[PDB]
Design a protein around this ligand. Structure first.
Ligand SMILES: CCCCCCCCCCCCCC(=O)SCCNC(=O)CCNC(=O)[C@H](O)C(C)(C)COP(=O)(O)OP(=O)(O)OC[C@H]1O[C@@H](n2cnc3c(N)ncnc32)[C@H](O)[C@@H]1OP(=O)(O)O
Ligand SMILES: CN1CCC(N(C)c2nc(N(C)CCC#N)c3ccccc3n2)CC1
Ligand SMILES: CN1CCC(N(C)c2nc(N(C)CCC#N)c3ccccc3n2)CC1
Ligand SMILES: [Mg+2]
Length: 411
């Protein structure tokens, strides 16, 4: 059933996943020396290319591939349109490895055919709390704690094959070459997410959406008017009213994050993320990179009163191309990023996120039910979507966890 995934060091079934009691590697121990120096073989009409994603023109080339060929729905109504500025931010965080950005071009004219990207992340991925209990009950605490130390691994994203080259087994070759490059740097695990079900997720969560511009969402068929609104003389008026938000934030002392906030934000974020089984560890430089405001990319606000930062939230922008509506070309989505609340309830913090996103012309706010996102779903009028996000590791056995035990946001 899986000619490629059956050959890789990942759990092969749910049944197998059910028998996993400790975090740890799947594959044989290996060294950099064991890994082929030469690129993985590829057909003579293609070549490997390493784009420089700090170079505008190379970012533009990858941007076009994704714009035209990246994830879309089944009815081909919307396709993600990650911006050039967003790609540079996502793919060049502190201490990234240029070699982990892998492309295929056709040798002749140099058309870009495929891409995959890895970036470093420092991740807590030791045995989860509920399994450390099981291990205590069995007298197996030492084995359960072996991999407790945060690990420097690879996060994979942006896998894409050109539409004209689909179902030709190019994706496996891209994955093998990426794994080689990562392994040549003495890194042996990766983390990735996908909507599709592959062997085998360690966690899955549904997507949730919060309408900000319902009239446009209905126009482009992102949304429909729910049946109950038909009992009203003016269904759309009632829908707009239902999703109306304040025009300015409600929390006193809300303001954009600045460089001087980085230590406080790192403190409160890392204290909060510790509570979850799987989550990132960020340095100051990583907090700066992922959270300082960046125009059209990432938006981050802190609550500061009486000279102390007590709370923050962040969101990032991913637009989508609206395929052949006559009124609109673009869907402007805000996604819930990291946050931490110490002074106010989470719903009160995130309401200000919706208010700012609406103020700035976003059409919808999206998120997965990771972190404590379920805690403000109903009050803030989010609803579940049809999509899931499944979380995977490469070369890491891991017990199934609930999505509310995952604290890694994947872009
Ligand atoms: C230590 C370091 C390790 C680093 C690596 C860690 C692994 C990272 C793994 C990648 C994480 C990516 C995270 C993201 O970016 S998820 C976003 C992925 N991108 C898209 O959905 C964009 C639009 N679609 C496409 O570009 C293509 O359809 C892709 C490229 C997705 C497949 O191309 P194509 O349709 O032309 O097929 P093929 O003939 O070449 O290949 C067929 C094989 O590919 C398996 N397949 C299909 N979709 C995915 C998928 N999303 N992840 C992993 N595998 C996938 C499929 O089961 C089959 O294998 P098997 O079932 O036969 O066994
Ligand atoms: C019936 N219906 C089905 C589409 C529609 N939707 C919610 C939707 N939107 C997708 N994109 C690219 C843009 C979403 C954002 N932000 C998508 C991508 C991949 C897989 C499914 C998907 N579904 C919701 C309305
Ligand atoms: C790796 N990766 C891929 C794009 C993903 N994404 C931004 C995303 N994905 C949606 N689906 C259904 C999973 C698609 C896949 N692969 C989605 C649905 C509705 C609204 C927004 C949405 N956003 C996020 C991370
Ligand atoms: Mg292919």
């Amino acid at each position: 059933a899986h000619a490629f995934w059956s050959t890789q060091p990942v759990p092969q079934t749910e049944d197998e996943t059910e028998k996993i009691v400790f975090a740890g590697p799947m594959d044989e121990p290996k060294t950099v020396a064991d890994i082929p120096e030469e690129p993985y073989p590829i057909a003579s009409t293609f070549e490997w290319w390493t784009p420089n994603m700090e170079a505008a023109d190379d970012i533009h080339a990858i941007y076009e591939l994704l714009r035209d060929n990246y994830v879309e729905d089944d009815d081909s109504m919307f396709r993600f349109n990650y911006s050039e500025e967003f790609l540079q931010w996502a793919l060049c965080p502190p201490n990234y490895i240029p070699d982990w950005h892998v492309a295929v071009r056709r040798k002749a004219d140099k058309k870009l055919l495929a891409f995959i990207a890895g970036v470093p992340v420092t991740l807590r991925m030791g045995t989860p709390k509920y399994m450390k209990v099981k291990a205590q009950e069995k007298g197996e605490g030492e084995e359960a704690a072996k991999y407790d130390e945060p690990r420097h691994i690879c996060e994979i994203n942006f896998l894409c094959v050109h539409k004209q080259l689909r179902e030709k087994r190019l994706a496996p070759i891209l994955i093998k070459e990426a794994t080689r490059r990562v392994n040549r740097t003495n890194v042996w695990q990766a983390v990735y997410t996908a909507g599709v079900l592959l062997p085998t997720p360690y966690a899955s969560g549904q997507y949730f959406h919060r309408s900000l511009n319902p009239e446009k969402l209905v126009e482009i068929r992102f949304s429909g008017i729910p049946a109950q609104y038909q009992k009203f003389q003016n269904p759309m008026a009632m829908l707009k009213r239902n999703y109306q938000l304040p025009s300015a934030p409600k929390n006193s002392g809300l303001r954009e994050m600045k460089p001087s906030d980085v230590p406080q934000v790192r403190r409160i974020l890392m204290n909060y993320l510790d509570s979850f089984d799987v989550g990132p560890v960020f340095s100051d430089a990583e907090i700066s990179h992922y959270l300082l405001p960046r125009d059209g990319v990432v938006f981050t606000y802190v609550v500061e009163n009486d000279k102390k930062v007590t709370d923050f939230f962040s969101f990032y922008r991913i637009p989508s191309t609206v395929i052949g509506n006559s009124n609109y070309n673009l869907l402007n989505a805000a996604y819930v990023h990291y946050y931490a609340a110490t002074s106010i309830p989470l719903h009160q913090l995130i309401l200000d996120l919706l208010i700012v996103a609406h103020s700035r012309g976003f059409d919808v706010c999206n998120m997965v039910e990771i972190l404590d996102n379920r805690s403000f779903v109903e009050q803030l009028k989010f609803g579940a979507g049809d999509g899931h996000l499944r979380y995977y590791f490469y070369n890491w056995a891991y017990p199934k966890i609930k999505p509310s035990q995952v604290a890694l946001v994947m872009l």
